[PDB]
Design a protein around this ligand. Sequence first.
Ligand SMILES: OC[C@H]1O[C@@H](O[C@H]2[C@H](O)[C@@H](O)[C@H](O)O[C@@H]2CO)[C@H](O)[C@@H](O)[C@H]1O
Ligand SMILES: OC[C@H]1O[C@@H](O[C@H]2[C@H](O)[C@@H](O)[C@H](O)O[C@@H]2CO)[C@H](O)[C@@H](O)[C@H]1O
Ligand SMILES: OC[C@H]1O[C@@H](O[C@H]2[C@H](O)[C@@H](O)[C@H](O)O[C@@H]2CO)[C@H](O)[C@@H](O)[C@H]1O
Ligand SMILES: OC[C@H]1O[C@@H](O[C@H]2[C@H](O)[C@@H](O)[C@H](O)O[C@@H]2CO)[C@H](O)[C@@H](O)[C@H]1O
Lengths: 138, 150, 138, 138
Amino acid sequence: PLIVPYNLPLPGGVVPRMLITILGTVKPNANRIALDFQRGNDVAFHFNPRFNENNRRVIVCNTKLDNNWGREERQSVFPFESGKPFKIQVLVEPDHFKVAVNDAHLLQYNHRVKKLNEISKLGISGDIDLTSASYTMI
Amino acid sequence: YPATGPYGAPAGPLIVPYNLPLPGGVVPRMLITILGTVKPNANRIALDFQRGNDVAFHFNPRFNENNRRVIVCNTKLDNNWGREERQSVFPFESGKPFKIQVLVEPDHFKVAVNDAHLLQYNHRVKKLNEISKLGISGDIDLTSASYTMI
Amino acid sequence: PLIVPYNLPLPGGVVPRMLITILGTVKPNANRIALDFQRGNDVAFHFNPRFNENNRRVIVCNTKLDNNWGREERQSVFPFESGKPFKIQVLVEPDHFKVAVNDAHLLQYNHRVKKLNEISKLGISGDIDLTSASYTMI
Amino acid sequence: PLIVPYNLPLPGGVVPRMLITILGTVKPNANRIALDFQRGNDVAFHFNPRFNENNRRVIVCNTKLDNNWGREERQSVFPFESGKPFKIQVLVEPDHFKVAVNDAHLLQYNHRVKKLNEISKLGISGDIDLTSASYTMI
Ligand SMILES: OC[C@H]1O[C@@H](O[C@H]2[C@H](O)[C@@H](O)[C@H](O)O[C@@H]2CO)[C@H](O)[C@@H](O)[C@H]1O
Ligand SMILES: OC[C@H]1O[C@@H](O[C@H]2[C@H](O)[C@@H](O)[C@H](O)O[C@@H]2CO)[C@H](O)[C@@H](O)[C@H]1O
Ligand SMILES: OC[C@H]1O[C@@H](O[C@H]2[C@H](O)[C@@H](O)[C@H](O)O[C@@H]2CO)[C@H](O)[C@@H](O)[C@H]1O
Ligand SMILES: OC[C@H]1O[C@@H](O[C@H]2[C@H](O)[C@@H](O)[C@H](O)O[C@@H]2CO)[C@H](O)[C@@H](O)[C@H]1O
């Protein structure tokens, strides 16, 4: 399959109506998953499901500017399950990313990095086996 | 030691940690003067210029960060510290008087220590008028703390 | 009166069966409150109700060793209301602190700083007017 | 060549007298390089040269425990150049990791993670073209 950590090129950027689809299986005893949309020295959009933060599951979203993480956005909705298949979809709008897991709307993160066109890679890491990493331009 | 009376809210003594009120906030050509003595065995000193829930300008002499002396400047937007600015020139010395001056300019804060210029810090918080207070903490005995326009 | 931020001295430390009681009033439009149990250059126990993190109220607890915050322990129970009087009680046990607000038990925080006898100072700050800070030894 | 980010498996963990060698070339217009010795959910040893942090080059070393970085150790000795090859070496000792660049000793980093045998993985990342990554005992 695809090896983790995995890089999905997005040369010529993210653009509105774009749909990133990530399919795979969560490992057993999973601790974490991360999607990292990168722009140059920054991480425009960090989607980080955490399977155990003091015995809560939480999704944390944020932006890294060079070495500094910004304001954390925390969500408790968490459809992943150890040892189970998943589908993560990221829809790009003008003002925000929208994220769905297992065909159901989960969250939105407003853009902090504005130059969408410069977002050139998606890092996919953590305790997953990856089956596919692809995107749709509608 | 708290001074009550008819001239305003109860006032804290000149003992660390201390808030120096800045009514009107800050404006260019403002000059803050701070006099005191560094305690023996100082670990740290800090100046914290505050606006609402942010620290617009944090000036933080550290006397041992892994056996180096370093001044760290930064900004805190409510719970988040941003890009650190580190400098190595460190005039302070344990058990020694000092004078810190902060001149406000439109582009930046200039900081001078013992009559000689030390560093510049560009404004990340732009609404200078909103900067309400100045925190002064750490391992210093404090002697005076005041502002005047120039 | 008591001026905020206030230092309550605990010379000779914190000791099992000790119960700290802080009375006061939350200011209008409060943003934050903080209790900081200090030890030399460390904060052995920071208890930090925040009135707005991304439109949630959360109590954040942690320990600061010199310049580093450790693992956050987050709790969403939050009895404080803007403009209303409060009571914070902190009971010291051999293995943890217990915290209760307005007579309702809130949480436990396990000691990370083990030398309880060196915890000299309790800092009380944020958007409050303070009426009394005292403790009982039982 | 090999593709960044990359995990060098360290089967049977690290153990004194292990010598890890990494060859590559710094990219033009570098910003960062990172070595991440991993144990479960932690980074035992992060070695992070930075080509421009407020117009200063610096190497930051640290340990990550779940989501928390501890105390930073900053060194200003920096032997890397944009476009230039390099040979990074890491010698494991009982008390610390010793690091050499282009066969000249650079720094030490005391162990914070003590169970060396659980350090299962070394992560290589940043603005480089990784040629090889291998180890051997000495
Ligand atoms: O300590 C290794 C770690 O540092 C993080 O950046 C730090 C930075 O060095 C410090 O100056 C700043 O104030 O705090 C940052 C957040 O911990 C990097 O983000 C991380 O990638 C590591 O390199
Ligand atoms: O953990 C106590 C500590 O939190 C700091 O803010 C954190 C914040 O909770 C976290 O979500 C963010 O990503 O990291 C921040 C920097 O550590 C507060 O700034 C500090 O005052 C304490 O309250
Ligand atoms: O940036 C000023 C701010 O620094 C915090 O400490 C930093 C420290 O300088 C850095 O090396 C480490 O990697 O991250 C720490 C936590 O953000 C202090 O805790 C805080 O008091 C301020 O001084
Ligand atoms: O926010 C994304 C960023 O979080 C870092 O972890 C935070 C942690 O969530 C917070 O509770 C604590 O106070 O500060 C940590 C350091 O910023 C992760 O380490 C990083 O990997 C990202 O996931």
